[PDB]
């Protein structure tokens, strides 16, 4: 009863059979979630639409990923993934930013319990691939505690609204590492051209940052 | 993604980080460096990293 | 019930995540035991990939100093009449006795391989070993 | 005082024996179906040898026999196979009863 | 550490490679007998390496020597020299 | 019931080796039982590389030093599960040992499945047996490979159903999805007999210790 | 479960006592054949299929209240057949170690 069920795609699929000519069936992609991290998705094939809904939504709850949410409202870090031919770029956002994401991603994030995140989908926008890649990336994300345990250093949050106050959001479980870590002069990180263009203001898309209803 | 190794170099935010602004006397700067040899390694990295910023400033 | 995504994390990770999320009403009987005595490696699914480049399996071959002596003995004499009783853990073959004699004679001070081999053969023949040379 | 595993492996009779090719070993017939003697010789796998026509009735379960090993495990990769295929049995030639 | 740890070395039990019968021996176009040992008695055809059991290098050497002898009047082309029929049969061929 | 549930259930988890399973075996015993013997180097599976001591004349040898620790962990886990009155299901499609394994199960008050594993014995148990059926709380593989040398479908099914699995993995096995893998020979009769005896002894010791603890608590 | 079967057994015993009272028979020696004859007389049905006629007469579950199955081969799904095969194979092993009008 704590889980909510949402439809993501309803496709009519036909097959060529000698006995019946063109056989018709319904394939339904269903996402379920309890709004507290536990969410899943499933595919239901049936001759009847309601039967497909029932099959998919009853099968989804047996395939529940648990998505870790930072402060119970957002992802822990930016996630860049390419599932098949679908690129998903998720940006961690502060409280109150809302869900500026693909409508399917908006629905899935509502099911998970994410309230603030950005998400851009590029390449193929196939709904099944989009959902699978989104769940893969969200499940594979690394929490602050895991990072602190892995590198044995305090994970400290710096907030502009809080000034120079250092907020220790994570601390290693085991002994702390006294290595002051490498002060990398230049980070060898693969940037995304769209993000740099937006930061430098060269991007002038008439569709970005459009006023939209609350999400 | 942005092409090339260390694509951060090709950003305004990185170019503006250069803290070296030459005096008005300086007009030409010649950077003689060796593509190989550990002793010149830093110089190479300098050419790879700080020549843009300097030229931006 | 529990998540059936066997390729996402381990059974312990999935069960703990679901219990924390409140989906699983009660922890399974094995959860406390796993928490108390976890295995050396978390049973996370992993797809095996075949090596393609210069990378090779780090499984080193097993060799000993007595292997050269055994090879020489088998080349000169062969298997021999004394069959191998592999069931007996303390069984010593003719080759093993030859190796022991070679090792003790080398410890005595002799260093030449041919001299060690011939002295070992003569000593075993004196001891009552049928060292039938094949060539 | 317990010796390390390396010592046991080094001094084991199986390691003392070199390649199994044409080595003489003593095996025990642990199974008989009709005429196929399943004999263990201390290796990982057993060997199956047809019952010889000479003194065939004298080959019974528990009989100790002499074998000349040819391969401790018959394996052979095939065209397009990623890993070596095995038949889960060794290859030995049965000579006769050991006494 | 411990002496019982296996040592890194090459295989001492490794058997030598099965050297071909003509390995290490000079093959000459004037040796009509040796060349005739590898040709068909009836047709004079040069046997393949799957029949002669020779390596690639020695098979090529034998082929070149046979061609040279045939073109230079040392060896019959369409058959085998009858005086060399009594030589040992190194080829893996069975006509009967 | 908390004074009972705590004292009987949680207390053995406070001990590194409550059932003293480390006395049941030694590296010498495993060596005698030909546990260390493995398949040919060609048949080697990648994930079994860390547990392989080395290759002796193209024959893989299983590191009994790691095998000792893995077997200690597996026996401790099995004993703790049996002590908690869990359901233990041995699985092995190796026909040669099938009978024996079944006997061992029948002698240790646990369950065995050595015959053909029908599709869905675990993922569809609610329909095959009944909606109120109780799935096994632990599955022990004496052989992790089917007769076509592929991994047993029971491994994947138990991973799906979140059932911990102890397993004897040879050099060609796939220990990725096994909760407590024990690298050891699974073909030699001596090795399989040793494994059966060890698991039987662990389960019997756990059950008798559970009876002793319950009786002692009742007499308190 | 077994509780339902036991309740049915008690109900059958009570009904058997009532039937013996109605027929005037001795409730002690009122056997199954007497029950069938009394039922056939009291409820005469001429349906040819004898299974459809009225009848007053006396599968199970393979695990207890704790969920532990009784048979060690339960998870095979064919515990009876495989137990029989196991016993036959054991007898064959014993025979090997030691050494018409029927169909
Ligand atoms: S075998 Fe040596 S040249 Fe062919
Ligand atoms: Mg095996």
From Swiss-Prot, chain B:
Residue stretches spanning the membrane: none
Domain of life of the organism encoding this protein: Eukaryota
Cell compartment(s), UniProt: Mitochondrion
Signal peptide location: none
Annotated disease: Combined oxidative phosphorylation deficiency 50: An autosomal recessive, mitochondrial encephalomyopathy characterized by intrauterine growth retardation, poor overall growth, delayed psychomotor development, hypotonia, muscle weakness, progressive loss of ambulation, and mitochondrial oxidative phosphorylation deficiency in patient tissues. Brain imaging shows partial agenesis of the corpus callosum.
Family the entry assigns: Belongs to the mitochondrion-specific ribosomal protein mS25 family.
Complex formation: Component of the mitochondrial small ribosomal subunit (mt-SSU). Mature mammalian 55S mitochondrial ribosomes consist of a small (28S) and a large (39S) subunit. The 28S small subunit contains a 12S ribosomal RNA (12S mt-rRNA) and 30 different proteins. The 39S large subunit contains a 16S rRNA (16S mt-rRNA), a copy of mitochondrial valine transfer RNA (mt-tRNA(Val)), which plays an integral structural role, and 52 different proteins.
Protein name per its UniProtKB record: Small ribosomal subunit protein mS25
Residues shown, of full length: 2 to 58 of 173
UniProtKB/Swiss-Prot annotation, chain D:
Entry-annotated residues carrying N6-acetyllysine: 58
Keyword Mitochondrion: yes
Record's keyword annotation contains Transit peptide: yes
GO function term, MF aspect, one: RNA binding
Compartment(s) where it occurs, according to its Swiss-Prot or TrEMBL record: Mitochondrion
Record text on subunit structure and interactions: Component of the mitochondrial small ribosomal subunit (mt-SSU). Mature mammalian 55S mitochondrial ribosomes consist of a small (28S) and a large (39S) subunit. The 28S small subunit contains a 12S ribosomal RNA (12S mt-rRNA) and 30 different proteins. The 39S large subunit contains a 16S rRNA (16S mt-rRNA), a copy of mitochondrial valine transfer RNA (mt-tRNA(Val)), which plays an integral structural role, and 52 different proteins.
Protein name: Small ribosomal subunit protein bS1m
Organism (species): Homo sapiens
Source lineage: Eukaryota, Metazoa, Chordata, Craniata, Vertebrata
Gene name of the record: MRPS28
UniProtKB/Swiss-Prot annotation, chain E:
A GO cellular-component term linked to this record: mitochondrion
GO molecular function: small ribosomal subunit rRNA binding; structural constituent of ribosome
Cellular compartment(s): Mitochondrion
Main location: mitochondrion
Keyword Transit peptide: yes
Family designation: Belongs to the bacterial ribosomal protein bS18 family.
Subunit organization: Component of the mitochondrial small ribosomal subunit (mt-SSU). Mature mammalian 55S mitochondrial ribosomes consist of a small (28S) and a large (39S) subunit. The 28S small subunit contains a 12S ribosomal RNA (12S mt-rRNA) and 30 different proteins. The 39S large subunit contains a 16S rRNA (16S mt-rRNA), a copy of mitochondrial valine transfer RNA (mt-tRNA(Val)), which plays an integral structural role, and 52 different proteins. bS18m has a zinc binding site.
General remark: There are 3 mitochondrial isoforms of bS18 in mammalia, localizing to 3 distinct sites in the mitoribosome. bS18m (bs18c, this protein) binds to the same site as bacterial bS18, mS40 (bS18b) binds to a novel location of the 28S small subunit, and mL66 (bS18a) binds to the 39S large subunit.
Protein name, UniProt field: Small ribosomal subunit protein bS18m
Gene source species: Homo sapiens (Human)
Gene name linked to the record: MRPS18C
Included range, full protein: 46 to 141 of 142
Swiss-Prot record, chain G:
Any GO molecular function: RNA binding
Compartmental location: Mitochondrion
A GO BP entry: mitochondrial translation
Transmembrane segments: none
Keyword terms: Acetylation, Mitochondrion, Ribonucleoprotein, Ribosomal protein, Transit peptide
One CC-aspect GO term: mitochondrion
Signal peptide annotation: none
Family statement: Belongs to the universal ribosomal protein uS9 family.
Assembly behavior: Component of the mitochondrial small ribosomal subunit (mt-SSU). Mature mammalian 55S mitochondrial ribosomes consist of a small (28S) and a large (39S) subunit. The 28S small subunit contains a 12S ribosomal RNA (12S mt-rRNA) and 30 different proteins. The 39S large subunit contains a 16S rRNA (16S mt-rRNA), a copy of mitochondrial valine transfer RNA (mt-tRNA(Val)), which plays an integral structural role, and 52 different proteins.
Protein name: Small ribosomal subunit protein uS9m
Lineage: Eukaryota, Metazoa, Chordata, Craniata, Vertebrata
Name of the gene this protein is made from: MRPS9
């Amino acid at each position: 009863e704590d889980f909510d069920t949402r439809i993501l795609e309803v496709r009519n699929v036909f097959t060529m059979t000698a006995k019946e000519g063109r056989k018709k069936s319904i394939r339904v992609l269903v996402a379920v979630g309890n709004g507290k991290g536990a969410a899943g998705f499933s595919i239901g094939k049936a001759t009847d639409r309601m039967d497909a809904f029932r099959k998919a939504k009853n099968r989804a709850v047996h395939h529940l990923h648990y998505i870790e949410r930072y402060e119970d409202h957002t992802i822990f870090h930016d996630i860049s993934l390419r599932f098949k031919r679908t690129h998903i770029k998720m940006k961690k956002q502060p409280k109150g930013y809302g869900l500026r994401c693909h409508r399917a991603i908006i629905t899935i994030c509502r099911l998970i319990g994410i309230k603030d995140m950005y998400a851009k989908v590029s390449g193929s926008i196939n709904m099944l691939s989009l959902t699978q890649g989104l769940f893969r990336g969200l499940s594979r994300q690394e929490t602050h505690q895991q990072l602190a345990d892995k590198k044995g250093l305090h994970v400290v949050e710096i907030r502009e609204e809080c000034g120079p106050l250092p907020i220790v959001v994570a601390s290693p479980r085991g002994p702390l590492r006294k290595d002051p870590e490498p002060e990398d002069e230049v980070p060898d990180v693969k940037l995304d051209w769209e993000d740099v263009k937006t930061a430098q203001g060269m991007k002038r898309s008439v569709w970005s940052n459009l006023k939209r209803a609350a999400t | 993604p942005m092409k090339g190794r260390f694509p951060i170099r090709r950003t305004l935010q990185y170019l503006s980080q250069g803290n070296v602004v030459f005096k008005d006397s300086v007009k030409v700067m010649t950077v003689n460096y060796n593509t190989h040899g550990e002793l010149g390694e830093g110089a190479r990295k300098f050419v790879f990293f700080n020549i843009p910023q300097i030229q931006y400033k | 019930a529990g998540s059936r995504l066997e390729t996402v994390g381990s059974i312990f990770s999935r069960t703990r995540d679901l219990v924390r999320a409140g989906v699983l009403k009660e922890k399974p009987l094995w959860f406390d035991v796993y928490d108390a005595f976890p295995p050396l490696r978390e049973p996370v699914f992993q797809r095996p990939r075949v090596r393609y480049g210069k990378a090779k399996a780090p499984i080193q071959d097993i060799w000993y100093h007595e292997d050269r002596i055994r090879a020489k003995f088998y080349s000169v004499y062969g298997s021999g009449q004394r069959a191998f009783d592999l069931f007996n853990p303390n069984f010593k073959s003719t080759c093993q006795r030859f190796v022991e004699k070679y090792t003790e004679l080398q410890k005595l001070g002799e260093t030449d391989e041919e001299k060690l081999f011939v002295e070992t053969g003569k000593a075993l023949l004196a001891e009552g070993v049928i060292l039938r040379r094949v060539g | 005082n317990v010796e390390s595993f390396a010592s046991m492996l080094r001094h084991s009779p199986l390691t003392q024996m070199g390649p199994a090719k044409d080595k003489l070993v003593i095996g025990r017939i642990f199974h008989i179906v009709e005429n196929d003697l399943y004999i263990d010789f201390g290796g990982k796998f057993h060997c199956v040898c047809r019952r010889p026509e000479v003194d065939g009735e004298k080959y019974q379960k528990g009989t100790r026999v002499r074998l000349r090993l040819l391969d401790l495990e018959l394996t052979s990769r095939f065209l397009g196979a990623t890993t070596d295929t095995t038949v889960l049995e060794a290859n030995a030639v049965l000579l006769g009863i050991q006494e | 550490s411990n002496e019982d740890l296996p040592i890194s070395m090459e295989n001492p039990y490794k058997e030598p490679l099965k050297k071909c019968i003509l390995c290490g021996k000079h093959v000459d176009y004037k040796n009509v007998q040796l060349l005739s040992q590898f040709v068909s008695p009836f047709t004079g055809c040069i046997y393949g390496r799957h029949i002669t059991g020779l390596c690639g290098k020695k098979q090529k050497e034998i082929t070149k020597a046979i061609k040279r002898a045939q073109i230079m009047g040392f060896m019959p082309v369409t058959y085998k020299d009858p005086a060399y029929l009594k030589d040992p049969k190194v080829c893996n061929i069975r006509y009967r | 019931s908390t004074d009972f549930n705590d004292k009987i259930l949680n207390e053995p988890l406070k001990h590194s080796d409550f059932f003293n399973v480390k006395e049941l075996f030694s590296v010498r015993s495993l060596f005698d039982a030909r546990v260390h013997l493995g398949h040919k180097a060609g048949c080697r599976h990648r994930f079994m590389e860390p547990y392989i001591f080395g290759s002796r004349l193209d024959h893989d040898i299983i590191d009994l030093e790691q095998t000792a620790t893995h077997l200690q962990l597996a026996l401790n886990f099995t004993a703790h599960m049996a002590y908690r009155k869990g359901i233990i299901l041995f699985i092995s499609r190796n026909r040669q040992f099938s009978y024996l394994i079944e006997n061992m199960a029948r002698d240790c008050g646990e369950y065995a499945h050595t015959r053909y594993f029908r599709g869905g014995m675990l993922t569809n148990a609610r329909l095959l047996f009944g909606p109120t059926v109780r799935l096994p709380d632990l599955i022990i593989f004496l052989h992790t490979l089917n007769n076509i040398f592929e991994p047993h479908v029971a491994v994947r099914d138990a991973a799906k159903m979140n059932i911990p699995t102890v397993g004897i993995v040879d050099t060609n096995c796939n220990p990725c999805l096994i909760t407590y893998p024990v690298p050891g020979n699974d073909d030699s009769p001596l090795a399989v007999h040793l494994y059966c005896r060890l698991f039987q002894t662990a389960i019997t010791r756990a059950k008798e210790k559970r009876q002793q603890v319950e009786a002692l608590y009742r007499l308190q | 479960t077994e509780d339902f079967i036991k309740k049915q057994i008690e109900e059958f015993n009570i009904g058997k006592r009532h039937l013996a009272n109605m027929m005037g028979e001795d409730p002690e020696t009122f056997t199954q054949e007497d029950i069938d004859r009394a039922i056939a007389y009291l409820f005469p049905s001429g349906l040819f299929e004898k299974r459809a006629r009225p009848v007053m007469k006396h599968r199970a579950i393979q695990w207890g209240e704790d969920g532990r199955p009784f048979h060690y081969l339960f998870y095979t799904g064919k515990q009876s057949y495989y137990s029989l095969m196991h016993d036959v194979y054991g007898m064959l092993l014993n025979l090997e170690k030691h050494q018409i009008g029927s169909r």
